[PDB]
Structures are given as C-alpha cells and as structure tokens.
PDB file of C-alpha atoms in Angstrom:
ATOM      1  CA  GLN U  26     -22.002 -15.681 -30.355  1.00  0.00           C
ATOM      2  CA  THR U  27     -23.040 -13.761 -27.323  1.00  0.00           C
ATOM      3  CA  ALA U  28     -25.235 -14.002 -24.188  1.00  0.00           C
ATOM      4  CA  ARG U  29     -26.303 -11.665 -21.624  1.00  0.00           C
ATOM      5  CA  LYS U  30     -24.970 -12.754 -18.135  1.00  0.00           C
ATOM      6  CA  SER U  31     -26.793 -12.801 -14.956  1.00  0.00           C
TER       7      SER U  31
ATOM      8  CA  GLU I   9     -24.469  -6.771 -20.117  1.00  0.00           C
ATOM      9  CA  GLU I  10     -23.485  -9.031 -23.289  1.00  0.00           C
ATOM     10  CA  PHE I  11     -20.486 -11.032 -23.358  1.00  0.00           C
ATOM     11  CA  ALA I  12     -18.821 -13.481 -26.164  1.00  0.00           C
ATOM     12  CA  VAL I  13     -19.634 -17.144 -25.387  1.00  0.00           C
ATOM     13  CA  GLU I  14     -16.983 -19.914 -25.854  1.00  0.00           C
ATOM     14  CA  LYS I  15     -19.129 -22.909 -25.833  1.00  0.00           C
ATOM     15  CA  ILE I  16     -22.005 -24.354 -24.158  1.00  0.00           C
ATOM     16  CA  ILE I  17     -21.030 -27.074 -21.390  1.00  0.00           C
ATOM     17  CA  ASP I  18     -24.554 -28.445 -20.270  1.00  0.00           C
ATOM     18  CA  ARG I  19     -28.243 -27.729 -20.322  1.00  0.00           C
ATOM     19  CA  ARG I  20     -30.994 -28.262 -17.817  1.00  0.00           C
ATOM     20  CA  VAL I  21     -34.793 -27.249 -17.305  1.00  0.00           C
ATOM     21  CA  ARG I  22     -35.289 -25.286 -14.088  1.00  0.00           C
ATOM     22  CA  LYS I  23     -38.343 -23.859 -13.216  1.00  0.00           C
ATOM     23  CA  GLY I  24     -39.822 -25.021 -16.467  1.00  0.00           C
ATOM     24  CA  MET I  25     -37.267 -22.901 -18.462  1.00  0.00           C
ATOM     25  CA  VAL I  26     -34.416 -24.131 -20.411  1.00  0.00           C
ATOM     26  CA  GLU I  27     -31.108 -23.085 -19.272  1.00  0.00           C
ATOM     27  CA  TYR I  28     -27.384 -23.625 -20.848  1.00  0.00           C
ATOM     28  CA  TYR I  29     -24.257 -23.802 -18.864  1.00  0.00           C
ATOM     29  CA  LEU I  30     -21.880 -21.513 -20.419  1.00  0.00           C
ATOM     30  CA  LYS I  31     -18.046 -20.992 -20.626  1.00  0.00           C
ATOM     31  CA  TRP I  32     -17.386 -17.249 -21.297  1.00  0.00           C
ATOM     32  CA  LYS I  33     -14.558 -16.231 -23.829  1.00  0.00           C
ATOM     33  CA  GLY I  34     -11.818 -14.934 -22.076  1.00  0.00           C
ATOM     34  CA  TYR I  35     -12.971 -15.651 -18.564  1.00  0.00           C
ATOM     35  CA  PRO I  36     -11.842 -18.676 -16.457  1.00  0.00           C
ATOM     36  CA  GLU I  37     -13.823 -21.914 -15.801  1.00  0.00           C
ATOM     37  CA  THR I  38     -14.894 -20.694 -12.313  1.00  0.00           C
ATOM     38  CA  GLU I  39     -16.923 -18.060 -13.976  1.00  0.00           C
ATOM     39  CA  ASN I  40     -19.167 -20.329 -16.044  1.00  0.00           C
ATOM     40  CA  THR I  41     -22.978 -19.758 -15.397  1.00  0.00           C
ATOM     41  CA  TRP I  42     -26.277 -21.087 -16.127  1.00  0.00           C
ATOM     42  CA  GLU I  43     -28.120 -18.744 -18.223  1.00  0.00           C
ATOM     43  CA  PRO I  44     -31.812 -18.961 -19.682  1.00  0.00           C
ATOM     44  CA  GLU I  45     -31.970 -19.766 -23.177  1.00  0.00           C
ATOM     45  CA  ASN I  46     -33.356 -16.332 -24.025  1.00  0.00           C
ATOM     46  CA  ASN I  47     -30.240 -14.627 -22.690  1.00  0.00           C
ATOM     47  CA  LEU I  48     -28.327 -16.388 -25.483  1.00  0.00           C
ATOM     48  CA  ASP I  49     -27.738 -14.979 -29.015  1.00  0.00           C
ATOM     49  CA  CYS I  50     -25.476 -18.035 -29.963  1.00  0.00           C
ATOM     50  CA  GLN I  51     -27.635 -19.715 -32.640  1.00  0.00           C
ATOM     51  CA  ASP I  52     -24.520 -21.555 -34.064  1.00  0.00           C
ATOM     52  CA  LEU I  53     -23.716 -22.923 -30.629  1.00  0.00           C
ATOM     53  CA  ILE I  54     -26.970 -24.018 -29.592  1.00  0.00           C
ATOM     54  CA  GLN I  55     -27.734 -25.941 -32.940  1.00  0.00           C
ATOM     55  CA  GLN I  56     -24.437 -27.608 -32.611  1.00  0.00           C
ATOM     56  CA  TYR I  57     -25.012 -28.419 -28.895  1.00  0.00           C
ATOM     57  CA  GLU I  58     -28.532 -29.745 -29.399  1.00  0.00           C
ATOM     58  CA  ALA I  59     -27.241 -31.915 -32.546  1.00  0.00           C
ATOM     59  CA  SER I  60     -24.361 -33.785 -30.794  1.00  0.00           C
ATOM     60  CA  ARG I  61     -26.061 -34.786 -27.814  1.00  0.00           C
TER      61      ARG I  61
END
C-alpha cells in the first residue's frame, strides 16, 4: 500500500 | 521515493491520464497530492475506491 510521490 | 498511502480521496482524468488524490500515511492533509495511477502500488485501495463510488 505505497505510491511514488511527485 | 515511495511512501505509505493512507487512503484515496478522489479520482480525476487529466491530460488523458487517471490520477488519484492521496492522503499519505503520517503526513498532514496539506501534503495530499494528485498522483498518476501508475505511481500507485495500492491495489486494495484502488479496488475499494472504484467499488464504493
């Protein structure tokens, strides 16, 4: 439950 | 870098791409960001979001 942050 | 996602707040299409408005675990709401769907490794949250709306 993760994501790349931009 | 990758970070833990607390929940999906909203969804939109922008420039033909699906984007999700994210609350990041352990960060304040002021840090919520729109992320393209391919930035997410959140299958459970996405399926739950797309199911309940």
